[PDB]
Amino acid sequence: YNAPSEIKYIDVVNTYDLEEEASKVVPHGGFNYIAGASGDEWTKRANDRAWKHKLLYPRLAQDVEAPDTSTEILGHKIKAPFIMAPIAAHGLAHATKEAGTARAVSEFGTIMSISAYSGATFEEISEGLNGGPRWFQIYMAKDDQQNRDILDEAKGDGATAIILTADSTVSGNRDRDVKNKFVFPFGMPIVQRYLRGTAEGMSLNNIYGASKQKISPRDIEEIAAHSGLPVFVKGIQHPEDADMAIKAGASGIWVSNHGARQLYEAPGSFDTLPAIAERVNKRVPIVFDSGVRRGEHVAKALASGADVVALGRPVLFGLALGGWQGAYSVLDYFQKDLTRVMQLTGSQNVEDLKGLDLFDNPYGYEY
Amino acid sequence: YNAPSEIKYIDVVNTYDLEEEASKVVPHGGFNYIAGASGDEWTKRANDRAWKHKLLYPRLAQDVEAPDTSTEILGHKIKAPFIMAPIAAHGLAHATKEAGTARAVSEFGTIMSISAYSGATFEEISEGLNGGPRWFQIYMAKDDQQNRDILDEAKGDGATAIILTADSTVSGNRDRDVKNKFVFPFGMPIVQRYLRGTAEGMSLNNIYGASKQKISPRDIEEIAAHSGLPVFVKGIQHPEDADMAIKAGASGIWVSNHGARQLYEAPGSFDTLPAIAERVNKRVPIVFDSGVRRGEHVAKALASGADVVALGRPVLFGLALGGWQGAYSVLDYFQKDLTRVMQLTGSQNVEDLKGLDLFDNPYGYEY
Amino acid sequence: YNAPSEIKYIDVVNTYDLEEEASKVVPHGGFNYIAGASGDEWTKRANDRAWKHKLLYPRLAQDVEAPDTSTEILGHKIKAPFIMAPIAAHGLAHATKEAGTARAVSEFGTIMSISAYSGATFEEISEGLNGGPRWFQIYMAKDDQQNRDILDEAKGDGATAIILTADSTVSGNRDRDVKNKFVFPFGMPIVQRYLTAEGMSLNNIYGASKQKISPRDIEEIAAHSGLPVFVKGIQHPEDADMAIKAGASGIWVSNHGARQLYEAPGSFDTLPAIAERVNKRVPIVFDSGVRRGEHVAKALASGADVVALGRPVLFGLALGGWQGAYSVLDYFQKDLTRVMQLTGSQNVEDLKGLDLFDNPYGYEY
Amino acid sequence: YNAPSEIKYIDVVNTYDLEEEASKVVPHGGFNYIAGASGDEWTKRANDRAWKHKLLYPRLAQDVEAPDTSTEILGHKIKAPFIMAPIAAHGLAHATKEAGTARAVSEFGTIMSISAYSGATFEEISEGLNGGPRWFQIYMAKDDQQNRDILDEAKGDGATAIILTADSTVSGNRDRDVKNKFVFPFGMPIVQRYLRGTAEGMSLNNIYGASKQKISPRDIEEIAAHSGLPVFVKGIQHPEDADMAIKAGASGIWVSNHGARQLYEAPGSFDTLPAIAERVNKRVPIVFDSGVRRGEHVAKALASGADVVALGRPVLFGLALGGWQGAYSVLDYFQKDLTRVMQLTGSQNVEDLKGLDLFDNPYGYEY
Ligand SMILES: Cc1cc2nc3c(=O)[nH]c(=O)nc-3n(C[C@H](O)[C@H](O)[C@H](O)COP(=O)(O)O)c2cc1C
Ligand SMILES: Cc1cc2nc3c(=O)[nH]c(=O)nc-3n(C[C@H](O)[C@H](O)[C@H](O)COP(=O)(O)O)c2cc1C
Ligand SMILES: Cc1cc2nc3c(=O)[nH]c(=O)nc-3n(C[C@H](O)[C@H](O)[C@H](O)COP(=O)(O)O)c2cc1C
Ligand SMILES: Cc1cc2nc3c(=O)[nH]c(=O)nc-3n(C[C@H](O)[C@H](O)[C@H](O)COP(=O)(O)O)c2cc1C
């Protein structure tokens, strides 16, 4: 598998351009595993276009200067209101894999979420983190002792939160991967204990098939009880699931449609956030993902009831283009992009973003 | 007329790509008679885009595993909540014609709808069905006695329901077939008695022209009284017609716009379904059709008041690609497609689909 | 300028296709005069896309057979609920000019509307019409004598109604015509008295015509002529009130095929508010974008009594003289007949009562 | 830097065509500095498409002839209800630069707004104006004394209003300029004092960066007191900013989004105008800009609460193609374009425009 290996900073004009730039250096199967989505990708497009539904106001004479992007979540002080989403198999994008990403996230000054489907070991990722905060994202085994073992290993590594991803009990209908007969070109060491052999050579379909299908609210209770860490439930698009998760002992709600990689013909993730936030009613923090590309998207999420957002495909494409420094350039971009938005919207700090008026655009994308 | 004749299973990634595939092995005229619709096909596009007006939510920690697609309608146990739509002249798609389709439907474990405009005889279809359940779809004669005879032969053959299609008293404005000067290359044995001759060489316009124009609610009561079978009324897009039909003695409502092949500049069929379901108020079963291409569509139709859906074009395209095995592959695709959708929506059985919350998408297709 | 000249029937599958086909037989400048509209033609597209705002229902077991398309308007019995709209300089389309259209309209069995900016004389047109009804559409001279004379000539020739066109006091911003330096290649007998048209822009022609039309003008035309008067060009309900009050016997809802005010609604979208104001006081003619039987149906379900046909008939004339134009009318009649059968309508009155499905998603659905 | 120099009238069919025409005579970097906007320019498109949201009615038999376009604002009599927007660096478009634009505006008979980021000195512009009225647009220095001098200097030149442009406290995300590495090829003599060096070679990001970031309502107060002139606050899109501005001593409101060059993923300017006009409630005059390309636009804006509009890009494109004569030709087109719209909408004068009904188009651009 010919993953790129060059390490270098990159100029980011916008993150959209990074997709096509990455397509030229990443192998065809892996690239399309990363970039693609369910069906004909209408819900991926909806994730993007949802940002035009609520528009930002420039505000004038607001007595603002040098906006501050720092915030805090569950007692982590972070440099900007975003974190790194859990993403499988970073080796598809760059030879330095999750250790590359981890170094970038750490030196930038935010939180790394570690996928259970990582192609790096905890030891390898930890080398990249170099002390930096990490949250571990579990894809559950069917066997209870194996979940206890995985969670114990995650906690031993330093995780300060557990992310239960529950929107992938079976795979999405990912046409590109089907058409490409995509299989993983390397192992997944954290979960291989419950796979039939090694992830190498398996389809995602069958790896999710090995994970737990019959997730119930008791799993949230049990993960909380066992780990003693705050538990996020990830993949929420319906507000009743945020109330269920909280009542089952969740410490955070992670609004997401898995980057449109899961259920097809579903809403753009952003359009779901306000009802979710209204139901959460500030009981616990909210992480939002699925389609964040610009500082304006960071701002709009917060104004709509998120505390932080999670970043995904653009960081991975930066990773492809420049290893840890390319991924860092993308994080840096987002920080600067937000800073501009903060200044022009009249926002001095992060809490101010959460209070912004939004202009309703009933005409949608074509205006 | 060089119809395809190969029999084989086929890979279905999505049903949409089956159209272009079928186009390369079906003669130009018949292919376009199958794919085409009225006018510039805006209402066919509407049938497809309607599915984006109501969007599915993924649901989490639902305690669902191995969902069951099995259901029952008018006492028939079927393997999934879909049945075969009545479609004329399957020999246009495949040399094995309706006998091929029958075998696929029967082997799969659902209901075959026999079109009065079949190019195959009752016994030739019965061959392929091998004992499997069948519903007969009447295009009425003007002559009362010819209707009684057609119903008698249908019932004698084993029909357990009669379907009256009443949205075709004259033909739609099918631009492709006008431009191609399409005429049928074979005969229609069941309705031949009222054609003045044979369907071979006749336009569809003139075949519809020979059937009954002055259909009335008495026709429904007469068919129910004579056959002694439950009667569906097919073609309904307005709720008042549902009230009419039930009052006239129908045992089922079949919501359909005939694949957009009849009235032009009409709504997408799915958009008309909630109003008709509300009016029906569970008094009889509802079959929905016109635009079903995905398991998501099956789920949405049920969530919106349908009890089952009927499949059309994609099963025909499958028949063209690999005979009965080809059509079978299509049925199997829909079954697996729906199973995924059930798992991700939190539906353990088919009844749970009927209670799903849908997200309203007032932006429509471009979002 | 050489207009086509061939006469023949045509196979009309839809009217949209006739635009491109005609483009291949009409000289460029003239064809684009016929086909073009103001600005980037956004409002002409709006006229066409408005039809998807209200959708028809198929209706079943309606006990209907052999629908009847015939109707009546201000005493004239017609074979279908449409008439020919007034259009200028038909010789741009076909050598046989307004006489060819006349004959088509006449044999088909509906009413012809005569433009004052016609290229043919009353007499040339009357031979075409062969005993058939006609409405004269006036563009007003700034001088009263000339209006009296035109009106008498028009009633002398046989006009049974008068159409006041009031939406063209100055021209639309027609970019095609400006880019093409388009000028009329021949003359308009009926109005040259206030100008020859040959070699002048439409801007300067409208320039000569009356800019300060007022409600008085409608009273006067009714008075002088003693014939039922239509006010043509209306898109706002208040002008329907203004009109009826000044003695109009009919409202003609229209935006001039989008050849006039730009960035305005599609014409069909304006129709309900106007019909509601009119409150069946006088008959309503509707135009600006009818292309299908479905459109005739929707306009009638929406408060119109008949529609007027424009572009497609003229494309039909380009292609095949009188016989082509006739094929288009025959198309519309048979197209309407299908829609009636599928919608559950036995007759034209049934069309005016159809329920329509509201589509708030618009054209892309 | 190869600015065009030809001086000639031009036959404007529509303003949109001027952009491509100008692109062939203006140097690449400059041209794209002028034409471009923030991000993917979605908000520049929204500026343009907002015009289709409210549609004009033709009105008949209105007894109207020879519409009068002239109007009055803050005691200037002007020939049509539009003025010239303050735009930096006309030298990017034409060697005659701001003196050329000035002559056109002066001869047409309206007001010139002078950008603090002019490439021409007050004297050069004054020569072109030849006694014509002028408003000066300030980009604030951070140093108080220096603002006093700038305003003293503008007042001495004959400014009869000051325009505070407050939506540019930092630059928009102008991807064209980033990608072209645009820097100014000449100086800005008026603001040299606070760049402490030439603008030549500097980016717009660093120029804005030198102007004042922390603009507060007190700045508006201090400018109105020190200058004794009516102050406009420019860049307003939210109704609260209009309240704030009038409260702080402003004598006019200027609704603008900087032609989409500033905050991205914001509304189209016109959609913001009614709510601002309702809040202002005729207390001061309103100038509207950002996307006016047609006479129909000027009408719609006045019908929506504007007193006059400000014209930007189309005028500069004219200047590129014809120096002062080409710019003049643009002003002349607008005036005739408006005149046609007055006649057909039944508007005898400018006040009549302000009373026009508009048709609400909820279907937006695609209809
Ligand atoms: C290539 C890829 C791999 C992913 N793998 C995982 C995973 O292992 N675990 C998980 O919880 N989410 C995973 N996600 C979803 C991300 O956590 C996140 O929801 C998504 O990337 C947000 O969408 P965006 O990148 O389009 O903005 C993955 C997403 C991508 C694109
Ligand atoms: C090629 C073709 C032939 C059809 N023939 C019949 C028929 O003979 N009888 C009938 O009731 N409906 C007929 N229909 C309508 C089908 O019952 C069904 O309503 C339609 O196929 C649903 O649209 P879809 O197939 O695009 O989903 C036909 C449809 C197609 C495409
Ligand atoms: C080429 C052309 C010339 C026209 N000339 C006139 C005219 O002289 N007087 C008039 O009242 N309307 C005129 N109209 C407007 C028509 O009466 C009618 O309102 C228009 O054709 C409706 O649009 P449609 O043909 O696109 O359906 C003209 C239209 C066209 C296309
Ligand atoms: C090249 C260019 C330079 C501009 N420079 C300035 C400026 O120096 N000061 C300012 O207040 N506005 C400036 N603007 C904004 C204009 O004042 C005005 O808001 C804008 O041109 C209106 O948008 P439109 O030209 O697309 O109609 C500029 C706009 C452009 C395109």
Coordinates of N, CA, C and O in Angstrom, one line a residue, chain B residues 42 45-46 49 53 169 171 173 175 179 213-215 217 234-238 241 244 263-268 271 361, chain C residues 13-14 17 51-52 55-65 292 294-295 298 338 341-342 355 357 361 363-365:
Chain B
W42 N -40.6 15.2 -15.9 CA -40.5 15.9 -14.7 C -41.2 15.2 -13.6 O -40.8 15.3 -12.5
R45 N -39.1 12.3 -12.4 CA -38.0 12.9 -11.5 C -38.6 13.3 -10.2 O -38.0 13.0 -9.1
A46 N -39.8 13.8 -10.2 CA -40.6 14.1 -8.9 C -40.8 12.9 -8.1 O -40.6 13.0 -6.8
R49 N -37.3 12.4 -6.4 CA -36.9 13.4 -5.5 C -37.8 13.6 -4.4 O -37.4 14.1 -3.3
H53 N -37.9 14.6 0.6 CA -38.7 15.5 1.4 C -39.0 15.1 2.8 O -39.3 15.9 3.7
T169 N -57.3 5.4 -18.4 CA -58.5 5.3 -19.3 C -58.1 5.8 -20.7 O -58.7 5.4 -21.7
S171 N -54.1 6.9 -22.6 CA -52.7 6.9 -22.3 C -52.1 8.2 -21.9 O -52.5 9.3 -22.3
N173 N -48.9 11.0 -22.1 CA -48.2 11.6 -23.2 C -46.8 11.1 -23.2 O -45.9 11.8 -22.7
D175 N -43.6 10.8 -24.6 CA -42.9 11.3 -25.7 C -41.9 10.3 -26.3 O -41.8 10.3 -27.6
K179 N -41.9 9.2 -30.4 CA -40.7 9.5 -31.2 C -40.2 8.3 -31.8 O -39.6 8.3 -32.9
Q213 N -63.1 3.3 -20.9 CA -62.8 4.7 -20.5 C -63.8 5.1 -19.4 O -63.4 5.7 -18.4
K214 N -65.1 4.7 -19.5 CA -66.1 5.3 -18.6 C -66.2 4.5 -17.3 O -67.3 4.0 -16.9
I215 N -65.1 4.3 -16.7 CA -65.0 3.6 -15.4 C -65.8 4.4 -14.3 O -65.6 5.6 -14.3
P217 N -67.8 4.2 -10.1 CA -67.7 3.5 -8.9 C -68.4 2.2 -8.9 O -68.1 1.3 -8.2
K234 N -56.2 0.8 -8.0 CA -54.9 1.3 -8.3 C -54.9 2.5 -9.1 O -55.5 2.6 -10.2
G235 N -54.0 3.5 -8.7 CA -53.8 4.7 -9.3 C -54.1 5.9 -8.5 O -54.0 7.0 -9.0
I236 N -54.5 5.7 -7.2 CA -55.0 6.8 -6.4 C -53.9 7.8 -6.0 O -52.8 7.3 -5.5
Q237 N -54.2 9.1 -6.2 CA -53.3 10.1 -5.7 C -54.0 11.2 -4.9 O -53.4 12.0 -4.3
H238 N -55.4 11.1 -4.9 CA -56.2 12.1 -4.2 C -57.0 11.4 -3.1 O -57.7 10.4 -3.3
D241 N -60.5 9.8 -3.6 CA -60.7 8.6 -4.3 C -60.6 7.4 -3.4 O -61.1 6.3 -3.7
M244 N -64.1 7.2 -2.0 CA -64.9 6.6 -3.0 C -64.8 5.1 -3.2 O -65.8 4.4 -3.2
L263 N -50.7 10.7 -16.0 CA -50.8 12.1 -16.0 C -49.5 12.8 -15.7 O -48.9 12.6 -14.7
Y264 N -49.3 13.9 -16.5 CA -48.1 14.7 -16.5 C -48.3 15.9 -15.6 O -49.5 16.4 -15.4
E265 N -47.2 16.4 -15.0 CA -47.2 17.7 -14.3 C -48.1 17.6 -13.0 O -48.9 18.5 -12.7
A266 N -48.1 16.4 -12.5 CA -48.7 15.9 -11.3 C -47.6 15.7 -10.1 O -46.4 15.7 -10.4
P267 N -48.1 15.6 -8.9 CA -47.0 15.4 -7.9 C -46.3 14.1 -7.9 O -46.7 13.2 -8.5
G268 N -45.1 14.1 -7.2 CA -44.4 12.8 -7.0 C -45.3 12.0 -6.1 O -45.9 12.5 -5.1
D271 N -45.4 12.1 -2.2 CA -45.9 13.2 -1.5 C -47.4 13.2 -1.3 O -48.0 13.9 -0.4
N361 N -38.0 18.1 5.4 CA -37.0 18.8 4.7 C -37.6 19.8 3.7 O -37.9 19.4 2.6
Chain C
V13 N -45.1 16.6 -31.1 CA -45.0 15.7 -29.9 C -45.1 16.6 -28.7 O -45.8 16.1 -27.7
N14 N -44.5 17.7 -28.6 CA -44.7 18.7 -27.6 C -44.4 20.1 -28.3 O -43.8 20.1 -29.3
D17 N -40.1 21.6 -28.4 CA -39.3 21.1 -29.4 C -39.4 22.1 -30.7 O -38.4 22.2 -31.4
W51 N -45.8 26.7 -13.8 CA -46.7 25.5 -13.9 C -46.5 24.4 -13.0 O -47.4 23.6 -12.7
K52 N -45.2 24.3 -12.5 CA -45.0 23.2 -11.5 C -45.3 23.6 -10.1 O -45.1 22.9 -9.1
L55 N -49.9 21.4 -9.1 CA -49.9 20.1 -9.8 C -51.2 19.5 -9.8 O -52.1 19.6 -8.9
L56 N -51.5 18.9 -11.0 CA -52.8 18.2 -11.2 C -52.8 16.8 -10.5 O -51.8 16.1 -10.4
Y57 N -54.0 16.5 -10.0 CA -54.3 15.1 -9.6 C -55.0 14.3 -10.7 O -56.0 14.7 -11.3
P58 N -54.5 13.0 -10.8 CA -55.3 12.1 -11.5 C -56.4 11.7 -10.6 O -56.2 11.6 -9.4
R59 N -57.6 11.5 -11.2 CA -58.8 11.1 -10.5 C -59.3 9.9 -11.2 O -59.2 9.8 -12.4
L60 N -59.8 9.0 -10.4 CA -60.2 7.7 -10.8 C -61.7 7.4 -10.7 O -62.4 8.0 -9.8
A61 N -62.2 6.5 -11.5 CA -63.7 6.1 -11.5 C -64.6 7.3 -11.5 O -65.6 7.3 -10.8
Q62 N -64.3 8.2 -12.4 CA -65.0 9.5 -12.5 C -66.2 9.4 -13.4 O -66.8 10.4 -13.6
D63 N -66.5 8.2 -13.9 CA -67.6 8.1 -14.9 C -67.4 9.2 -16.1 O -68.4 9.9 -16.4
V64 N -66.3 9.3 -16.7 CA -66.1 10.3 -17.7 C -65.6 9.6 -19.0 O -64.9 8.6 -19.0
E65 N -66.1 10.1 -20.2 CA -65.7 9.5 -21.5 C -65.9 10.6 -22.6 O -66.9 11.4 -22.5
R292 N -48.7 23.5 -22.9 CA -49.3 22.1 -22.8 C -50.8 22.2 -22.4 O -51.3 23.2 -21.8
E294 N -51.9 20.5 -20.0 CA -51.9 20.7 -18.6 C -52.0 22.2 -18.1 O -52.6 22.5 -17.0
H295 N -51.4 23.1 -18.9 CA -51.3 24.4 -18.6 C -52.7 25.1 -18.8 O -53.1 26.0 -18.0
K298 N -54.7 24.1 -15.8 CA -54.4 24.8 -14.5 C -54.8 26.2 -14.6 O -55.2 26.8 -13.6
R338 N -56.8 14.7 -23.4 CA -56.2 13.7 -22.6 C -56.3 14.1 -21.1 O -56.8 13.3 -20.2
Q341 N -59.6 13.8 -19.5 CA -60.0 12.4 -19.2 C -59.3 12.0 -17.9 O -60.0 11.3 -17.1
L342 N -58.0 12.3 -17.8 CA -57.3 11.8 -16.6 C -57.6 12.5 -15.3 O -57.4 12.0 -14.2
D355 N -59.3 20.7 -8.0 CA -58.4 20.9 -6.9 C -56.9 20.8 -7.5 O -56.7 20.2 -8.5
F357 N -52.7 20.4 -6.3 CA -51.7 20.1 -5.3 C -50.7 21.3 -5.3 O -50.1 21.7 -6.3
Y361 N -41.9 23.1 -3.1 CA -40.4 22.9 -3.4 C -40.0 23.5 -4.7 O -38.9 23.7 -5.0
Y363 N -39.2 24.1 -8.7 CA -39.0 23.4 -10.0 C -38.1 22.1 -9.8 O -38.3 21.1 -10.4
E364 N -37.1 22.3 -8.9 CA -36.1 21.2 -8.7 C -36.7 20.1 -7.7 O -36.2 19.0 -7.6
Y365 N -37.8 20.4 -7.2 CA -38.5 19.5 -6.3 C -37.8 18.9 -5.1 O -37.9 17.8 -4.7

